[PDB]
Design a protein around this ligand. Structure first.
Ligand code: XD6
Ligand code: XD6
Lengths: 214, 214
């Protein structure tokens, strides 16, 4: 299955570079930002379903789920929200939906905390604090399942998904963690971070843990 | 992606019918049989790799993993063993590899315990004690990933896999549990059954648990 390549809007490329290189101290803020986006995407399918209830049937359970995959050094953040079509992935994540972007970079230069990133509406990119690569796997009721992929470079790919588990509906952020950021694979560390900055999340936050039976 | 349909050898069809309809009491024995097959498949890749070490590289971790999926009423038993090519799935699971089969049915008629099924080499089919449908997802180093599927009828399908997560190497038995057998989705029940009939398994048996953070 053939990938398509797209160019990032230039300011997004600049932002990713700022973020993936920054020695900023509180890298854990990425999880709050991603849970927040997850929650918003869920709000959206729930709101849409007020007038179109069958939109829920592709996945009636509304949840946020976090899945460490230690062997692959991967952390997945999944939700059963509204999801994104191919065109939404291209539009929302790369070729446009910007500044926010420029204004946040200006705030940064002036001394603003990276944690403000979500107030500028670009909190997604905070994932580069702990990951050097990301796959966004998404299924909207309106399209097939697709994979958007970026390594913080100036270009991203979008590929029809024939390799991942089917999601009924929603989105998975598959983070390929940096070698020094593997603590976010750890149950206790993950739990600690979640409890700290996400008390008023209306959806279940599920942690998937692998335990050896003895 | 187009499925291919195959006919079961007739005695296998008879065995599945005996098993899926039986009111036998100790249905939990299926897990021992499947963990045993998992362990054997792992022995095989480990033995093969003695003289061909790179056979391990597609998935260097040797494990058995059990994953309840409550919403789908599914239980998955995964291993990173040798796996099966398309032709092996067809051969090993349906169109041949038999009696065992007939001899076990004869032993059953005479009064033998269903738990002897593994000593006749057909323990795989014990899964129909608790499931009315099964998908066997397999990746051998020698072939693409494939899905073999059966509902205990006289025919099964084999389909090139473009819908499930990639496994590096090995096999997943995806059991669609009967409505009265949902206890095997439960962490405590699963743990209890494992500990009982599998103390001398040389590989880690991992249980995947989903816990809501609070
Ligand atoms: O407020 C929702 C919006 C769209 C709805 C769909 O979004 C999503 O699937 C989604 C998700 O489920 C988890 C995530 O980490 C992210 Cl980055 C996204 C996509 C965005 O948020 C991009 C901007 C649009 C805002
Ligand atoms: O002894 C191994 C054999 C083949 C090697 C590969 O088997 C496997 O992938 C495999 C597994 O990983 C888990 C399972 O529940 C089952 Cl049913 C199988 C397939 C069989 O056992 C069928 C008979 C052949 C014996």
């Amino acid at each position: 299955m053939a990938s398509e390549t797209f160019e990032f809007q230039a300011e997004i490329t600049q932002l990713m570079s700022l973020i993936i290189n920054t020695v900023y101290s509180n890298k854990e803020i990425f999880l709050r930002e991603l849970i927040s986006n997850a929650s918003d995407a869920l709000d959206k399918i729930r709101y849409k379903s007020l007038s179109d209830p069958k939109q829920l049937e592709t996945e009636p359970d509304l949840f946020i789920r976090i899945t460490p995959k230690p062997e692959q050094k991967v952390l997945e953040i999944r939700d059963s929200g509204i999801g994104m079509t191919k065109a939404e992935l291209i539009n929302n994540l790369g070729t446009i939906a910007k500044s926010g972007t420029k204004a946040f970079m200006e705030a940064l230069s002036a001394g603003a905390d990276v944690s403000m990133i979500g107030q500028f509406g670009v909190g997604f990119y905070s994932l580069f604090l702990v990951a050097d690569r990301v796959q966004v796997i998404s299924k909207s009721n309106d399209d097939e399942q697709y994979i958007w992929e970026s390594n913080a470079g100036g270009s991203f790919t979008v590929t029809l998904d024939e390799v991942n588990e089917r999601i009924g509906r929603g989105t998975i952020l598959r983070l390929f963690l940096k070698d020094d950021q593997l603590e976010y694979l750890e149950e206790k560390r993950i739990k600690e971070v979640i409890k700290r900055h996400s008390e008023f999340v209306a959806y279940p936050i599920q942690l998937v843990v692998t335990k050896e039976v003895e």
